[PDB]
Every structure is written in structure tokens, then in C-alpha cells.
């Protein structure tokens, strides 16, 4: 009501396109803004890949311990963890943490390969009831975020529903659900995004994303002071290929939908 | 300099008092702004406490695995990790990680108690040649940040020199230095502060703080794309007791001093 008006006011001054999906698990209420429009996921896609590899680890005992070779030719555009291990190895646990907490694009490419390509991540999405998610490309081209391109996109509504099932639902075994939530809570990249819009007392696990067209994304599980968890997806994209990131817009969207 | 004009402009437009110390380890060059003025450290003091415990673990080789009791009465104002272990235990390693990466105030009180009180943190600072740093109080009163109050203060220059010795120098043993850097690089709270002012490709370990009078702090070790490491300290405080935190001022400061 006032929230829809305020989200429209924010978008109108933002210089881009804003998508919001909030799920309040206290009462299963939702706040949706362009929640059925497709947005480029960029690195928010890493949550689906890490979750798919967690699911694999329910049946392959010690999968997370399995060392994976990192070669110089594996490195892509953003490799803060992987570069230390070129001509060496990282475990699937280390690749999962590097992708989620550091947004390591080489780490994500090893998760994708472990799942049999982009289509294997999409198949996992389908298996947990997400019919909207699609991963089409590897890193780093999955972040081109070209307006109108359906590659590597989802909708705020579908991503909010998926994150709820992965982090609070029974899409994963209990140990795997706890590991995902532990990784998301240890994110290093999120303080300027959704978190920036919330009271300092609230606990957040999130995964950010960014790419071309100034695309600026965050998906978060939020444990508010004295309240049941929230799921929040904030996606934002701009019309110019070289636009700057707008994490402030995401913070503003989070303040609007949580202001009560 | 251009840099001096930019920092003076940032400070004046912020309404506050800004303290900046950059060390460039390529050539030991410095950028300095009010770098010898005292500022309330707030949670940036956690680095000295965690480093003091690391130093103790060089002679007490099992210390980081020691279980510490968390009682309900131990909980202070911000306990994101410790509240999960009330009526249980956490190891000194888990408490160091909680303090550094989550700014857990109950975890910091455990580190202070391990060192025999705020005096024990100050004694470690003096053992590594920091004659400026003082810790006077426990959490959460060490964050009051009252203008003119010398308690729980240091200077940007002294904290930058100290962070250099701890993370890049020989204040700690090689293992302990590596562990401190690993903890700082895994900080969850920093993406809106120094990091937000830097090129995305630069790797950062940092410790934020905030307290009374809108005090907003960050201390960081920076491995730039293709350059020798930097140490940067950005301290900020405001005249009004319940002023808003301003992490954007620290990001602006970081951009100004690194743009060259
Ligand atoms: C995913 O959204 C991005 C992953 N890493 C590439 C970067 O450059 C991260 C910093 O924006
Ligand atoms: C740190 O500066 C002061 C307290 N740390 C915990 C807190 O109260 C806010 C988040 O850092």
C-alpha cells in the first residue's frame, strides 16, 4: 500500500529497474514488486550451485572433502581464493565457501562442472520445484546481464520461494541446510546491500551479485530481533552497459519493505 | 595535496572529525589526515585482543582449542554467535573468529578476560611497540565514544603501524600472523566501509567498529591488483550523541587516498 508506492518512488529515482520479493515466515505474507519479471541473477546463482553440491553430498559420503585441481587456464575475471591454489587443489567445501562468501568466479565454475554444466544447476532447480530459474552459461559470461536476455535469469518471486525451501525448508537434509545457512551467514560481500537497510541487531545470511548494465542484486535470509525469519530478494538493473553498482538502492528497498 | 583538499572537503561535508592513515608497503609512503589525533576505537580494538590471544597461543600451544563457558549473564548488547552457545562452551579460536568477523561483544569480553582485563590488551600493545593504544573498559562501555574521553582510544598512525606489524610484519609468529589475516579476510561486516571505496579486484581483510556519537571506523590490510599491500585506517566520529553511522564516509576516504 504505502510500501508499493514507496518502492515505485525508489525505482523512479534509481535510474533502473527494481524487483523485490519479501516472504515473512511469521504469517507467510509477501511484498512483491515486479516479482514475476525476469532479472539477471549474476552471482546470486551461486546459491543454487552450492545447494546442488550440498544435495550431492547427502549420497556421496565425504564429497565436500574431494580435492579439485585448479589450473592457470581455469582462472577467470575474479578469483580471490582460487588464484592462491593454481597448479594445486581446493576441496568442494572450499570451492563452495569461496563461491558463496567471496563470490569467487573460478570456484563457481568448478561447482558448475561438478553438476555437469549449467544445465545440471537448472535440473537441481527443477528437482526442488523452481520452474523459473535457468542457468545457461559458465563464469564469467553468466554476468553479462544484457537487458531482454533470458539467459541466467530468474524472477524475485521464484528466487524468494527457492531460498526459503533451501535455508528454512526441507529441500536439503538437515546437516546440508545448516551448512548453507552457516556459509550465507559468513558472507563477506553483503554489508552495503540488504543488510545496510536493516537494524544492526538483525542477523543476515545473503549472497550478492553484480554484472553488466550496473546489475546489483542480493538475496537474504534475515533473522530479525524477536521475530520469525524473512526471505528477501532485491534485484536491480540499469539501461547503460557500463552503469555503476547501486547497492544503496538495495539497502533502501530492504528498509522500505521491513519498516512495518 | 589534491588528497588533503578532498579529505578536508569530505570531513566538512560529513559534519564530523575524520582520521586517516595509509601505509603503502611498496615504498613505506604514507597519507595522513589528523593521523596523530585520538579516536574511540570501538570494535577496531578487537584486533588487538585477538592478536594478544594469538601471541599467548605461541607459548600455550593448545590455547586456541580451550573451551570457555558462555553463561546467560555473559550476554551483552550484540551477541550474534555467543547467544547460540549460552549454557555451553566456545573455544578461544571460535571466540576470536566471532569477535573479528561478526563483531560479537560477548566474544570480545571472553578475549579480554583471557588476557586478565583491558590492561592485558594494553600490555600486549606495549610488548609490540604500540605506546598509543589504550583499552580501559569491557564491552559494551568501551564504545561510548564521548568527545574528549581518552579511554579506549588510539590514533590512526599508531593503529596503521600496529596493523602492519600484526598482518605483514613479525609482531606474531608466521602461523599466528596467517591465522589473523585469514580471520580478517573473512570479516562479514566490512563491504560498506573501506572495501566500498576500492576497485572490486583488490583483496581486503578488515575490522569495522561503531559506537556513540555516530563513531564509524574501519581498519584494513589491502592486497591491491598487482601492487604491494596497503594498510589503511579510517576513523570517524560526530558531535551529536545519537548521530547515524556513516560507513559511506570511510568508503569515500578510501577512494580518495587510493585513486593514485
Ligand atoms: C557475481 O555477481 C560476481 C562475482 N565476482 C565478479 C566480481 O567482480 C565481484 C565484484 O563485483
Ligand atoms: C563495534 O564497534 C562495537 C560493537 N560491535 C558490535 C555492535 O554492537 C555493532 C556491530 O559491530
Strand partners, A22: A31, A232
Atom of ligand 2 nearest to the CA of B108: 5
Instruction: State the catalytic residue, choosing from B14, B43, B45, B252.
Output: B43
Using CA atoms, how far apart are residues A77 and A141, in angstroms rounded to an integer?
10
H-run or E-run covering B249: helix B247-258
**Across the interface, do A190 and B186 touch by the CB < 8 Å criterion?**
no
DSSP B1: -
Q: For helices B46-57 and B174-185, what crossing angle results, to 10°?
A: 150
Helix (H, G, I), strand (E, B) or coil at B103: coil
CB nearest to A186's CB, from B188, B192, B245: B188
Per DSSP, helices labelled H in A58-186 are 92-102, 105-114, 118-127, 156-167, 174-185
> Domain spanning B1-260: which CATH class is it, in words?
alpha beta
Q: What is the 3-state secondary structure (H, E, C) of B127-157?
A: HCCCCCCCCCCCCCHHHCCCCCCCCCEECHH
| Residues 153-212 in B contacting A (C-alpha not used; CB under 8 Å) | 185-193, 196, 200-201, 203, 208, 210
- φ/ψ (deg, to 5) at A185: -65, -25
Tell whether omega for the bond before B115 is within 30 degrees of 0, i.e. cis.
no
| Residue burial B100-111, b: 16+ Cβ < 10 Å; e: rest | bbbbbbbbbbbb
Q: For helices B174-185 and B156-167, what crossing angle results, to 10°?
A: 120
Spell out the domain ranges in chain A: 1-260
Instruction: Report the 10 Å Cβ neighbour count for A186.
Output: 18
On the 0-12 / 13-18 / 19+ scale of CB atoms within 10 A, B260 is: exposed
Strand partners, A203: A223
Helix (H, G, I), strand (E, B) or coil at B241: coil
Residue A43 CA, chain-centre distance (Å), reads 6
CB nearest to B191's CB, from A190, A200, A201: A190
CB nearest to B188's CB, from A187, A192, A196: A187
C-alpha grid cell, residue A64: 565436500
A43 is catalytic: yes
Cα separations (Å) of A219 from A71, A224, B146?
Answer: 31, 15, 37
Show Cβ contacts of residue B108 under 8 Å, excluding neighbours closer than 6 positions.
Answer: B43, B45, B46, B49, B99, B139
- Residues in B closer than 8 angstroms to A190, CB to CB, are 188, 191
Q: With beta carbons less than 8 A apart as the criterion, state whether A231 and A173 touch.
A: no
CA-based nearest residue to A2, from A252, A195, A230, A257: A257
Q: Is B232 left (phi over 0), alpha (psi -120 to 50) or beta?
A: beta
Answer yes or no: is the C-beta of A209 below 6 A from any ligand 1 atom: yes
Using CA atoms, how far apart are residues B166 and A2, in angstroms rounded to an integer?
51
CA-based nearest residue to B37, from B158, B194, B205: B158
**Across the interface, do A188 and B192 touch by the CB < 8 Å criterion?**
no
| Residues 228-247 in A contacting B (C-alpha not used; CB under 8 Å) | 247
Q: With beta carbons less than 8 A apart as the criterion, state whether B100 and B78 touch.
A: no
Best probe of the B interface among A192, A203, A223, A224, by most B CBs < 10 A, is: A192
**Across the interface, do B80 and A203 touch by the CB < 8 Å criterion?**
yes
What is the distance in angstroms between the Cα of B141 and the nearest Cα belonging to chain A? 17
Integer-rounded Cα radius of gyration of chain B: 17
Declared resolution, Å: 1.9
Show Cβ contacts of residue B139 under 8 Å, excluding neighbours closer than 6 positions.
Answer: B76, B77, B105, B106, B108, B109, B112
Using CA atoms, how far apart are residues A193 and A254, in angstroms rounded to an integer?
8
| Interior angle at CA A253, CA A252 and CA A259, nearest 5 | 85
Cα separations (Å) of B112 from A220, B46, B66, B128, B177?
Answer: 33, 9, 15, 17, 20
Atom of ligand 1 nearest to the CA of A211: 2
Helix (H, G, I), strand (E, B) or coil at B166: helix
B89 touches chain A (CB under 8 A): no
| Residue burial A93-109, b: 16+ Cβ < 10 Å; e: rest | bbbbbbbbbbbbbbbbb
CA-based nearest residue to B243, from B15, B9, B30: B15
Q: β-strand B67-70 against B88-91: which pairing, if any?
A: antiparallel
- φ/ψ (deg, to 5) at A145: 55, 40
Q: Is A55 left (phi over 0), alpha (psi -120 to 50) or beta?
A: alpha
Atom of ligand 2 nearest to the CA of B143: 3
CA-based nearest residue to B256, from B22, B13, B12: B22
Helix (H, G, I), strand (E, B) or coil at A154: strand
What is the distance in angstroms between the Cα of B196 and the nearest Cα belonging to chain A? 8
H-run or E-run covering A21: strand A17-24
Helix (H, G, I), strand (E, B) or coil at B175: helix
Q: With beta carbons less than 8 A apart as the criterion, state whether B35 and B132 touch.
A: no
DSSP A162: H
On the 0-12 / 13-18 / 19+ scale of CB atoms within 10 A, B138 is: middle
Instruction: State the catalytic residue, choosing from A14, A29, A43, A245.
Output: A43
CA-based nearest residue to A214, from A189, A253, A245: A245
Amino acid at each position: 500500500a504505502d510500501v508499493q508506492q514507496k518502492l515505485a518512488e525508489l525505482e523512479r529515482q534509481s535510474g533502473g529497474r527494481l524487483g523485490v520479493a519479501l516472504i515473512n515466515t511469521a504469517d507467510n505474507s509477501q511484498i512483491l514488486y515486479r516479482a514475476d519479471e525476469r532479472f539477471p541473477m549474476c552471482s546470486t546463482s551461486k546459491v543454487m550451485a552450492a545447494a546442488a553440491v550440498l544435495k550431492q553430498s547427502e549420497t556421496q559420503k565425504q564429497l565436500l572433502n574431494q580435492p579439485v585441481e585448479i589450473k592457470p587456464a581455469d582462472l577467470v575475471n575474479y578469483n580471490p581464493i582460487a588464484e592462491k591454489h593454481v597448479n594445486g587443489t581446493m576441496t568442494l567445501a572450499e570451492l563452495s565457501a569461496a563461491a558463496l562468501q567471496y563470490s569467487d568466479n573460478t570456484a563457481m565454475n568448478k561447482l558448475i562442472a561438478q553438476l555437469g554444466g549449467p544445465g545440471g544447476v537448472t535440473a537441481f532447480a527443477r528437482a526442488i520445484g523452481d520452474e523459473t530459474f535457468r542457468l545457461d552459461r559458465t563464469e564469467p559470461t553468466l554476468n553479462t546481464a544484457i537487458p531482454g536476455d533470458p539467459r541466467d535469469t530468474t524472477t524475485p518471486r521464484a528466487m524468494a520461494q527457492t531460498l526459503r525451501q533451501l535455508t528454512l525448508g526441507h529441500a536439503l537434509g538437515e546437516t546440508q541446510r545448516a551448512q548453507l545457512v552457516t556459509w550465507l551467514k559468513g558472507n563477506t560481500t553483503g554489508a552495503a546491500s540488504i543488510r545496510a537497510g536493516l537494524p544492526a541487531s538483525w542477523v543476515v545470511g545473503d549472497k550478492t551479485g553484480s554484472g553488466g548494465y550496473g546489475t546489483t542484486n542480493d538475496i537474504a535470509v534475515i533473522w530479525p530481533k524477536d521475530r520469525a525469519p524473512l526471505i528477501l530478494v532485491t534485484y536491480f538493473t540499469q539501461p547503460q552497459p557500463k552503469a555503476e553498482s547501486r547497492r544503496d538502492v538495495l539497502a533502501s528497498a530492504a528498509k522500505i519493505v521491513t519498516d512495518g
